[PDB]
RNA sequence: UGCUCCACACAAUAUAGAUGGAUACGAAUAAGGCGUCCUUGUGGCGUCGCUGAACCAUAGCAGGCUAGCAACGGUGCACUUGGCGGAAAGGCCUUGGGUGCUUGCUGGCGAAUUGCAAUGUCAUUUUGCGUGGGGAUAAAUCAUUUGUAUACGACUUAGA
């Protein structure tokens, strides 16, 4: 039709951090439309893709992906924690991610 | 959900609006703030004028041109508040601040765009009834902002054209509502009503 | 020739006022105010929808325009009998406010097939409405 | 401490050969749980009789429920408290549906208006006023007028979203 | 304290119509029309029987209820000024130098000029507020009468005249010269 | 055989981060919106809110080929009529017909093997290069010169 989306939008906020030490191994994601941990429990274990573009074609594509998954909820406001096979680059704080509906339980 | 979010700054509390926008910018949302001159600060006009004068007196002693710049315009007073809530010396903070535009009044192209409010930062909701508050336009004028009159004149001109647009929109909305009400009680409408629509 | 004043109608905190609980185990049920404890807390009772007699803060409940005649301090059986006599549920269900609550609950319950049907019906209704707007 | 609870605490001196079966003193204690109630009991028996926890024994502790939790009552409360410069007695009136929440209101009131911590307060007495016109504080007396009804002007609605498209109203 | 309701009553007479906006009061009577902004008080007006208006404060504190009685007086002064009017009379007080008070005009401005105050060569100009009427009355000497439907304007114009003749650089207990309000009353009182 | 604009063709370059729609009164908030009527007002009456949990859009090989019915609507694209918009207008509203689609309704055909998933590629920026179609045909600096200038630069004058 006009929309072909099968993923929920999300935003890469930052790494897990204290006041003055961050941890790139874990990322904080805001899922569009999730406001509480109770809602954020639905997306636990779902796969996240970060989709970006590069100038150099690699394997028949100028588009590249970093694949991760939602591990747990974070705070009271629906923010979740995500882990990616390679850590997100930290210039993507504020950048969009795609949270897929697979693996699917409902 | 919008690509650009236009906030009408009228009747908002400057610091609570500032924190909201600073979080929005850092989270990657482009924000335009209009009618900066209609922003509110809680407290009397004298208190806030005294606070700006205290801000005015601090400057690099040996060269006043390398010191704390004291911007007078309301949009810049808002911008200064929003800086300091943004780590503005970093690349991430610069990229956040580049997602923001603050204007006096409503200029084009935002005249014909939806303006939102932030109820979290609205004075009418936050401030206790009877509490004295300041308007950023008269604060800015008292500390040296020059363009309150031109802003007011252009805003009156915009409000007149906008009221005329609204009169036409209201007439069409009336006609649309009448056609939709007439279509009700038909078969398709009753099936729709059984589905919450 | 006459004094004109805007009345500024307000829902009053009063015995026999009907309230909708928004926070807690009830959260969407109708109760009646039986006592006023202080400026912020009122004793409420919702025996028809099963709200226990309790002291509740006014900030977690929303006053409705509906009121019914009820003595102050009326016990649960008295509250229920006068609630049935005044037919508070039926007056509530007639309100566009309750219609809107039922509407959003019915919308949330729709399946994927039901949503697809809603699209098809909306397009058909739109077809008739647009044709009418063109003719008028 | 979702709220206070009221316990009856009965204790006695330890029995001796000289005096078997001592006198069994009892108090009503407002405390968050059993342990605090027993501690408060000994602390107050410290000030009345020659006995301490080591020379004494807790015979019974029983939570005391409100006889009618769903009846609004006017409570008169006598408290003794230590301010920064001395000790003072006062009497306050609290309207609510139970003794425990009336006392809970009282501790909040003492903290707010006199900066009196729970550390620095003695509940001398709590008693319902069974008759109107024995109520003496105007802040509770104003609520007993016939057919009382007031509005709640300037309703402020809580928004779940960050942005509103409507420029709201405070009507009610 | 937080009183639940505090209540005040404004009585309106036979030939007066009082219209209240959000909190903009318009009082119309025999002598004209007054308007007053009261959007700083947070009170509620309600019409009772076309002879009684009730203004109330709900869940108000000490300063709030004090403002309520203030509002009642302000509306009362509107109704009094639109039916009976306000008339302030001032007396010229001078020991040696006679005070010369006249009404002059400059491009339609209607000033009150004080000349010869303590023998000063400076002429004192006090503007006449809109709605205020100045007259100098026969049968009693050195007196100026200010009249109007607005008590605030009549009183402030009278105060402006009294203040402009403040003796400077002298013992004011000995140098009493000035123009002093001597009577506060009504125009159509009889 | 230079420069500039347009159009289409390939290259390269990147992306602070498209993935249905940024969806326009103003003002008050101890008040308002909408509708209706009149004696056009600080009017009567009705109605609404208690969130956008909305409205709009939205089905078709990432959306194919093809047959009809009903209506004369919707919408796209260029060509076009007029008007408005200077705060940063660069957009808004319209007119006319033309050329498409239309899922408002009823059909017939196609899809497969990307193999049980791999963004599975659909966007908008900049700069080149080529082709074909319009358009225009300068200056500045150094050197020389002045002294209203001047440490040197700079400044300020003159010179087919
Ligand atoms: Mg970060
Ligand atoms: Mg963290
Ligand atoms: Mg500095
Ligand atoms: Mg708007
Ligand atoms: Mg300056
Ligand atoms: Mg002297």
Swiss-Prot record, chain A:
Which UniProt keywords are listed? Acetylation, Cytoplasm, Isopeptide bond, Ribonucleoprotein, Ribosomal protein, Ubl conjugation
GO CC annotation terms, alphabetical: cytosol; cytosolic large ribosomal subunit
What does the record say about PTM?
N-terminally acetylated by acetyltransferase NatA.
Per the UniProt record, one Pfam family is Ribosomal_L35Ae
Q: How does it assemble?
A: Component of the large ribosomal subunit (LSU). Mature yeast ribosomes consist of a small (40S) and a large (60S) subunit. The 40S small subunit contains 1 molecule of ribosomal RNA (18S rRNA) and 33 different proteins (encoded by 57 genes). The large 60S subunit contains 3 rRNA molecules (25S, 5.8S and 5S rRNA) and 46 different proteins (encoded by 81 genes).
What does the UniProt record say this protein does?
Component of the ribosome, a large ribonucleoprotein complex responsible for the synthesis of proteins in the cell. The small ribosomal subunit (SSU) binds messenger RNAs (mRNAs) and translates the encoded message by selecting cognate aminoacyl-transfer RNA (tRNA) molecules. The large subunit (LSU) contains the ribosomal catalytic site termed the peptidyl transferase center (PTC), which catalyzes the formation of peptide bonds, thereby polymerizing the amino acids delivered by tRNAs into a polypeptide chain.
Q: What is this protein called?
A: Large ribosomal subunit protein eL33A
Q: Which organism is it from?
A: Saccharomyces cerevisiae (strain ATCC 204508 / S288c) (Baker's yeast)
- Lineage of producing organism: Eukaryota, Fungi, Dikarya, Ascomycota, Saccharomycotina
Q: Which gene encodes it?
A: RPL33A
From Swiss-Prot, chain B:
Q: Which GO terms describe its biological process?
A: cytoplasmic translation; maturation of LSU-rRNA; negative regulation of translation
Post-translational modification (record): N-terminally acetylated by acetyltransferase NatA.
- Locate residues linked as Glycyl lysine isopeptide (Lys-Gly) (interchain with G-Cter in ubiquitin): 175
List the Pfam families hit by this protein, alphabetically: Ribosomal_L13
Quote the SUPFAM superfamilies the UniProt record gives.
Ribosomal protein L13
For this UniProt record, the keywords arranged alphabetically read as follows: Acetylation, Cytoplasm, Isopeptide bond, Ribonucleoprotein, Ribosomal protein, Ubl conjugation
Q: Which GO terms describe its molecular function?
A: mRNA binding; RNA binding; structural constituent of ribosome
Top-level taxon in the UniProt lineage: Eukaryota
Q: What is its main location?
A: cytoplasm
GO cellular component annotations, sorted alphabetically?
Answer: cytosol; cytosolic large ribosomal subunit; nucleolus; ribosome
InterPro entries membership: Ribosomal_uL13 (IPR005822), Ribosomal_uL13_CS (IPR023563), Ribosomal_uL13_euk/arc (IPR005755), Ribosomal_uL13_sf (IPR036899)
Localization per record: Cytoplasm
Additional facts recorded:
Present with 43300 molecules/cell in log phase SD medium. There are 2 genes for uL13 in yeast.
Assembly description: Component of the large ribosomal subunit (LSU). Mature yeast ribosomes consist of a small (40S) and a large (60S) subunit. The 40S small subunit contains 1 molecule of ribosomal RNA (18S rRNA) and 33 different proteins (encoded by 57 genes). The large 60S subunit contains 3 rRNA molecules (25S, 5.8S and 5S rRNA) and 46 different proteins (encoded by 81 genes).
Q: Spell out the family assignment given in the record's similarity comment.
A: Belongs to the universal ribosomal protein uL13 family.
PANTHER family named among the record's database cross-references:
LARGE RIBOSOMAL SUBUNIT PROTEIN UL13 (PTHR11545:SF3), RIBOSOMAL PROTEIN L13 (PTHR11545)
Protein name per the record: Large ribosomal subunit protein uL13A
Q: Which organism is it from?
A: Saccharomyces cerevisiae (strain ATCC 204508 / S288c) (Baker's yeast)
The gene designation is RPL16A
Swiss-Prot record, chain C:
Is Acetylation included in the keywords of this UniProt record?
yes
Main location as per UniProt: cytoplasm
**What GO biological process term is on the record, naming one?**
maturation of LSU-rRNA
Q: Where in the cell is it found?
A: Cytoplasm
> Where are the membrane-spanning stretches?
none
What InterPro entries does the database record attribute to this sequence? KOW (IPR005824), Rib_uL2_dom2 (IPR014722), Ribosomal_eL14 (IPR039660), Ribosomal_eL14_dom (IPR002784), Translation_prot_SH3-like_sf (IPR008991)
Modification comment: N-terminally acetylated by acetyltransferase NatA.
What does this chain do? Component of the ribosome, a large ribonucleoprotein complex responsible for the synthesis of proteins in the cell. The small ribosomal subunit (SSU) binds messenger RNAs (mRNAs) and translates the encoded message by selecting cognate aminoacyl-transfer RNA (tRNA) molecules. The large subunit (LSU) contains the ribosomal catalytic site termed the peptidyl transferase center (PTC), which catalyzes the formation of peptide bonds, thereby polymerizing the amino acids delivered by tRNAs into a polypeptide chain.
Q: What does the similarity note say?
A: Belongs to the eukaryotic ribosomal protein eL14 family.
Its quaternary organisation is: Component of the large ribosomal subunit (LSU). Mature yeast ribosomes consist of a small (40S) and a large (60S) subunit. The 40S small subunit contains 1 molecule of ribosomal RNA (18S rRNA) and 33 different proteins (encoded by 57 genes). The large 60S subunit contains 3 rRNA molecules (25S, 5.8S and 5S rRNA) and 46 different proteins (encoded by 81 genes).
Q: What is this protein called?
A: Large ribosomal subunit protein eL14A
* Gene behind the chain: RPL14A
UniProtKB/Swiss-Prot annotation, chain E:
Query: Per the UniProt entry, what are the Gene Ontology biological process annotations, in alphabetical order?
Result: cytoplasmic translation
| CC annotations in GO | cytosol; cytosolic large ribosomal subunit
Quick check: keyword Ribonucleoprotein in the entry?
yes
In its keyword annotation, does this UniProt entry include Lyase? Answer: no
Mention any Pfam family matching this sequence. Ribosomal_L6
Q: Which InterPro entries match?
A: Ribosomal_uL6-like, Ribosomal_uL6-like_a/b-dom_sf, Ribosomal_uL6_a/b-dom, Ribosomal_uL6_CS2
Instruction: Give the GO molecular function terms.
Output: rRNA binding; structural constituent of ribosome
- Kindly list the places in or outside the cell where this protein is found, as annotated in its UniProt entry: Cytoplasm
Signal peptide coordinates: none
Q: Which UniProt keywords apply?
A: Cytoplasm, Ribonucleoprotein, Ribosomal protein
Predominant subcellular localization, coarse grouping: cytoplasm
What does the miscellaneous comment read?
Answer: Present with 52400 molecules/cell in log phase SD medium.
Relate the assembly described in the record.
Component of the large ribosomal subunit (LSU). Mature yeast ribosomes consist of a small (40S) and a large (60S) subunit. The 40S small subunit contains 1 molecule of ribosomal RNA (18S rRNA) and 33 different proteins (encoded by 57 genes). The large 60S subunit contains 3 rRNA molecules (25S, 5.8S and 5S rRNA) and 46 different proteins (encoded by 81 genes). uL6 lines the binding pocket for eukaryotic elongation factor 2 (eEF2).
Which PANTHER family does the record match to this protein? Answer: 60S RIBOSOMAL PROTEIN L9 (PTHR11655:SF16), 60S/50S RIBOSOMAL PROTEIN L6/L9 (PTHR11655)
In which family does this protein belong, per the annotation? Belongs to the universal ribosomal protein uL6 family.
Quote the protein name from its UniProt record: Large ribosomal subunit protein uL6A
Q: Which gene encodes it?
A: RPL9A
């Amino acid at each position: 039709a006009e929309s072909h989306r099968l993923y929920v939008k999300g935003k890469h906020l930052s790494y897990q951090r204290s006041k003055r030490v961050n941890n790139p191994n874990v990322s904080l994601i805001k899922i569009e439309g999730v406001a509480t941990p109770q809602d954020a429990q639905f997306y636990l274990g779902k796969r996240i893709a970060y989709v970006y573009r590069a100038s150099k074609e690699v394997r028949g594509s100028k588009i590249r992906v970093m694949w991760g998954k939602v591990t747990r909820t974070h705070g009271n406001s629906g923010v979740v924690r995500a882990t990616f096979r390679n850590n997100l680059p930290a210039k993507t704080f504020g950048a969009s991610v795609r949270i897929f509906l697979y693996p699917s339980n409902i | 959900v919008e690509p650009v979010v236009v906030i009408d700054g009228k009747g908002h509390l400057v610091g609570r609006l500032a924190s909201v926008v600073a979080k929005q910018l850092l989270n990657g949302q482009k924000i335009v703030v209009v009618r900066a001159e209609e922003l509110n600060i809680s407290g009397e006009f004298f208190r806030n004028k005294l606070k700006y004068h205290d801000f005015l007196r601090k400057a690099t002693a040996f060269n006043k041109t390398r010191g704390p710049f004291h911007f007078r315009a309301p949009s810049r007073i808002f911008y200064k508040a929003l800086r300091g809530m943004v780590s503005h010396k970093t690349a991430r903070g610069k990229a956040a601040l580049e997602r923001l535009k603050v204007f006096e009044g409503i200029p084009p192209p935002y005249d014909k765009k939806k303006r939102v409010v932030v109820p979290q930062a609205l004075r009418v909701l936050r401030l206790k009834p009877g509490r004295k508050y300041t308007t950023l336009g008269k604060l800015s004028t008292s500390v040296g902002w020059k363009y309150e009159d031109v802003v007011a004149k252009l805003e009156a001109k915009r409000k007149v054209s906008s009221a005329e647009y609204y009169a036409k929109k209201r007439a069409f909305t009336k006609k649309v509502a009448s056609a939709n009400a007439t279509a009700a009680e038909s078969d398709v409408a009753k099936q729709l009503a059984a589905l919450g629509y | 020739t006459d004094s004109i004043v805007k009345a500024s109608n307000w829902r009053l905190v009063e015995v026999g006022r009907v309230v909708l609980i928004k926070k807690g185990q009830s959260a969407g049920k109708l109760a009646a105010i039986v006592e006023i404890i202080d400026q912020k807390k009122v004793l409420i009772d919702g025996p028809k929808a099963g709200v226990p007699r309790q002291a509740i803060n006014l900030g977690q409940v929303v006053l409705t325009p509906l009121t019914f005649a009820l003595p102050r301090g009326a016990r649960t059986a008295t509250v229920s009998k006068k609630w049935a006599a005044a037919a508070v549920c039926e007056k509530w269900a007639a309100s566009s406010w309750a219609k809107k609550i039922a509407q959003r609950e019915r919308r949330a319950a729709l399946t994927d097939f039901e949503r697809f049907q809603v699209m098809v019906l909306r397009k058909q209704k739109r077809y008739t409405v647009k044709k009418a707007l063109a003719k008028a | 401490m979702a709220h206070f609870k009221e316990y009856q605490v009965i204790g006695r001196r330890l029995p001796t050969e000289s005096v078997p079966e001592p006198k069994l003193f009892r108090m009503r204690i407002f405390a968050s749980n059993e342990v605090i109630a027993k501690s408060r009991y000994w602390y107050f028996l410290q000030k009345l009789h020659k006995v301490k926890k080591a020379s004494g024994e807790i015979v019974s502790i029983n939570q005391i429920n409100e006889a009618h939790p769903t009846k609004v009552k006017n409570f008169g409360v006598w408290v003794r408290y230590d301010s920064r410069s001395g000790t003072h007695n006062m009497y306050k009136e609290i309207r609510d549906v139970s003794r425990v929440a009336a006392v809970e209101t009282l501790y909040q009131d003492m903290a707010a208006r006199h900066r009196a911590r729970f550390r620095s307060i003695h509940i001398l007495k709590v008693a319902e006023i069974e008759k109107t016109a024995d109520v003496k504080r105007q802040y509770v007396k104003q609520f007993l007028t016939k057919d009382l009804k007031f509005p709640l002007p300037h309703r402020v609605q809580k928004s779940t979203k960050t942005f509103s498209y409507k420029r709201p109203s405070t009507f009610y | 304290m937080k009183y639940i309701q505090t209540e005040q009553q404004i009585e309106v007479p036979e030939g007066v119509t009082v219209s209240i906006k959000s909190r903009i009061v318009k009082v119309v009577g025999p002598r004209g029309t007054l308007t007053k902004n009261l959007k700083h008080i947070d009170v509620t007006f309600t019409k009772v029987n076309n002879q009684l208006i009730k203004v109330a404060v709900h869940n108000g504190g000490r300063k709030h209820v004090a403002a309520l009685r203030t509002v009642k007086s302000l509306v009362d002064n509107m109704i009094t000024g639109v039916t009976k009017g306000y008339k302030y009379k001032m007396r010229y007080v001078y020991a040696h130098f006679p005070i010369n008070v006249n009404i002059v005009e400059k491009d339609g401005a209607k000033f009150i000029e004080v000349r010869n105050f303590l023998g000063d060569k400076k002429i004192r100009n006090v503007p006449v507020r809109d709605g205020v009427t100045i007259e100098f009355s026969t049968n009693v000497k050195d007196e100026i009468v200010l009249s109007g439907n607005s008590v605030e304007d009549v009183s402030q114009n009278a105060a402006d005249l009294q203040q402009i003749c403040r003796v400077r650089n002298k013992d004011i207990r000995k140098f009493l010269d000035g123009i002093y309000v001597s009577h506060k009353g009504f125009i159509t009182e009889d």
